[PDB]
């Protein structure tokens, strides 16, 4: 954005009746699981999809809004923002990046899914290109977002972006566009687009 | 958003350098004339790529950080929304819809172009639909998006979506997930997904 950006947007359906929950100050908590999927032709020219499920969370107001009414197969559209948290050892890890939604809209089901993330920020450690038996080049990279605190995301890219971006340097700022996946458990971005923030200006010494 | 939701995110490259310009109460406008397109293959199965030239807005504190230092040729990811206007005769038209940008990020072209727009709003009319020669459908919407005024944006979709389309009413409310495209002149929204955002709730009479 200014610099940090950070934004998903998804439609999926519910797999779970919503779980309403409240904290002691009276703020209304309401996680949604929701499930879609995202297709690609590879190499073999296959047409494929790939299912994605992410939990997604709603704070306050809207939660309490639609706290009861959501059912368990209801199709949503999602606008929200990674966030990225860290701790000691109690609930099962020690980061976790989950999507923190802003705001969601049910949507009729008939009578559809999207996954987009936009990303621009700047890369916390060299990029870690590898590559596949059949020769595929991959990149691993993680990226720190500051549009309170500094969210750390990991970001994967493939055959010619994954090449480009090895030339990245720790340090370097990037905007990313891409799709929310999974994978301990593990949800990061696979970048279908990849662009180099330029910078500096205006050194009038 | 709320229920009124109007963004727009472009990658395209200046046509020209841009225009600086500065009100008499001293806030600085940037016009940008961006450029780039848009493939989709026909029913003929043949992959075809159509342009979109598009003017975009900035405003006061980042247009003077950008002015002058912007140059044709240069890639941007921009990031904004669209704008209605109207009035009564001088600047050629009694309305207009442009792309007013809530901040833009130079890009390095290289050692790729993005078009998409996420409207939802009401429909201020019946829609509608007409076919082409070939018997292919098309619809025609008006579209209130209000998240200071209401904003009317025009909408079309084609085949399937609309078909769908057409089976709803002035007033009722839609989700537009498409390209910003150009056509006197007129900016108006290409859909590439149309959804319904469902009514109504707590009626505890």
Redesign the interface.
């Known amino acids: ?2 610099r940090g ?1 950070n934004q998903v ?1 998804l ?1 999926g359906t519910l797999t779970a009746r919503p779980d309403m929950r409240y904290t002691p100050g009276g703020l209304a908590i309401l996680d949604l699981n929701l499930a879609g999927q995202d297709a690609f032709t590879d190499e073999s020219g296959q047409e494929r999809e790939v299912p994605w499920y992410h939990r997604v969370r709603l704070l306050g107001r809207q939660a309490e ?1 639609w706290g009861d ?1 959501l059912e368990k197969g209801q ?1 949503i ?1 999602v ?1 929200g923002r990674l966030e990225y948290r860290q701790w000691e050892k109690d609930g099962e890890k020690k980061s976790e990046v989950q999507v923190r939604a802003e ?1 969601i ?4 089901g008939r009578g ?1 899914a ?1 996954n987009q993330v ?1 990303l ?1 920020g700047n890369l916390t450690r060299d990029p870690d290109l590898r590559y596949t038996p059949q020769g595929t080049a991959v990149v691993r990279l993680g990226l720190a977002v500051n549009e309170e605190r500094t969210h750390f995301l990991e970001v994967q890219a493939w055959r010619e972006l994954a090449e480009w971006a090895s030339e990245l340097a720790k340090g370097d700022g990037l ?1 990313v ?1 891409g799709r929310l996946v999974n994978d301990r458990f593990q949800t990061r971005v696979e970048a279908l ?1 990849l ?4 910078e500096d ?2 050194p009038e010494e």
Do not use: Q, S
């Open positions: 954005m200014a950006l947007f439609i809004m009414l199709l559209f606008e705001f809209d049910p949507l009729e559809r999207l936009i621009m905007l566009i687009r662009e180099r923030p330029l200006f205006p």
